[PDB]
Amino acid sequence: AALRQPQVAELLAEARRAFREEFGAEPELAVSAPGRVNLIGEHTDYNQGLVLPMALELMTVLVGSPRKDGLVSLLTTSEGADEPQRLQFPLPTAQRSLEPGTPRWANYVKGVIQYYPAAPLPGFSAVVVSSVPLGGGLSSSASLEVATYTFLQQLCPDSGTIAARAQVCQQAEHSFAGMPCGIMDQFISLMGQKGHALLIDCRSLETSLVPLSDPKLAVLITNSNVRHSLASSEYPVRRRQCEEVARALGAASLREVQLEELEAARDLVSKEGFRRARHVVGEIRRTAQAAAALRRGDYRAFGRLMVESHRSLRDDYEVSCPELDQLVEAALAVYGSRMTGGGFGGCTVTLLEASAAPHAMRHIQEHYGGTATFYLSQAADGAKVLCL
Numbered sequence: 001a002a003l004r005q006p007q008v009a010e011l012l013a014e015a016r017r018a019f020r021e022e023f024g025a026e027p028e029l030a031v032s033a034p035g036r037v038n039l040i041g042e043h044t045d046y047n048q049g050l051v052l053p054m055a056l057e058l059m060t061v062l063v064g065s066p067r068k069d070g071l072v073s074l075l076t077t078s079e080g081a082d083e084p085q086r087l088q089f090p091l092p093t094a095q096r097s098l099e100p101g102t103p104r105w106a107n108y109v110k111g112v113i114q115y116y117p118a119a120p121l122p123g124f125s126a127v128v129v130s131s132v133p134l135g136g137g138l139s140s141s142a143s144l145e146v147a148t149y150t151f152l153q154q155l156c157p158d159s160g161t162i163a164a165r166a167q168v169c170q171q172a173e174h175s176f177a178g179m180p181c182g183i184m185d186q187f188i189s190l191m192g193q194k195g196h197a198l199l200i201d202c203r204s205l206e207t208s209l210v211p212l213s214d215p216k217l218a219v220l221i222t223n224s225n226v227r228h229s230l231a232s233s234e235y236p237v238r239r240r241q242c243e244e245v246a247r248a249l250g251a252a253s254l255r256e257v258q259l260e261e262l263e264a265a266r267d268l269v270s271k272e273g274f275r276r277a278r279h280v281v282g283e284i285r286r287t288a289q290a291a292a293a294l295r296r297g298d299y300r301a302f303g304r305l306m307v308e309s310h311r312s313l314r315d316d317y318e319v320s321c322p323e324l325d326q327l328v329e330a331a332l333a334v335y336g337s338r339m340t341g342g343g344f345g346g347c348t349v350t351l352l353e354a355s356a357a358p359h360a361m362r363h364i365q366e367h368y369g370g371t372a373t374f375y376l377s378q379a380a381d382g383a384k385v386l387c388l
């Protein structure tokens, strides 16, 4: 109906024309980094827990060339970017360090350059494009962080690990966008592989690539086209009260605490507090079950754990919103459905039979009060490079 096609050949083609227009030469490099859907394991990554994301064909592309003048020149063409669409700045030095400011989309690139571990980092000219809906809950900011990082490696190869690069991109998000994210979005955008979900242990940083082949099974992502104020503001608050519980219970994280251990600890925590822990502590177990459900290829089954996720995010972690609750109702008539990412708006993810839709999308559009947009998501590759 209103399914947005990933248009990735078109997206690279656009970036290249805009580059040749803007800088008077053919760009030497293309990189991409995907946005992401989390299938299951919400608000667990910063509780040293488990997540089961996959990477999307929705991506951010940098096309660009090194410079010799030690300065960075950026053009973005992504419609929703705040103005101006261009920014230049000198590379940071021991004296001058990059600072967050205006425009906001540039803060992601600045952050990553500021924390890039390797040297010498030369200047560069780049066009930035993205088919990741900006602020839609599919990690537009992680795709731009990891796209930038991936471009910096072509200018000055790091001798790093996947985790060190994820932490760089994550620090850019903390310091330059004031968003105190865990490691999920960066990790999946680095490490995603076509036809696989990526089970991440956010305690050990051991990762599994779980085949998601079977073409009988689809993932429908539905953009609510809503972002509530509470989003930016309430994520840190949830994180802070996850620390208080861990503090009180002598646990270095909520990973190390067990549902039986917290049931017996109702006395020692807020009703807000216990409700947030029964989600996390719970929400870890079900991601482990889901993982072991995918592997066994039971796609009805971890419906339950997915719908169970949603209920718990909505009733216990209190980070759903009426729009998310009702896209779920609309779809859940499909193996399953739940909010995905940080919540207070953005997208749901629905695990249906490929054949089922586009009845899901006749029905969601015609039973969602807001504006639905759809992606039918193949599990995608992570960060990529194409020499031009």
Ligand SMILES: O=C1CCCC2=C1C1(CCCCC1)N=C(Nc1nc3ccccc3o1)N2
Pocket (backbone or CB within 6 Å): 060, 076, 078, 080, 081, 082, 104, 105, 106, 128, 129, 130, 134, 135, 140, 141, 144
């Ligand atoms: O305002 C917010 C708060 C919610 C989270 C968030 C945003 C904005 C910040 C900059 C203006 C647009 C919206 N952008 C992103 N991600 C992003 N990915 C991009 C890829 C290419 C170009 C620009 C990009 O911005 N995320």
Ligand SMILES: OC[C@H]1O[C@@H](O)[C@H](O)[C@@H](O)[C@H]1O
Pocket (backbone or CB within 6 Å): 038, 041, 042, 043, 044, 045, 046, 181, 182, 183, 184, 185, 341, 342, 343
């Ligand atoms: O599942 C909740 C997730 O929210 C994301 O939007 C954030 O970037 C992740 O680190 C994770 O905390």
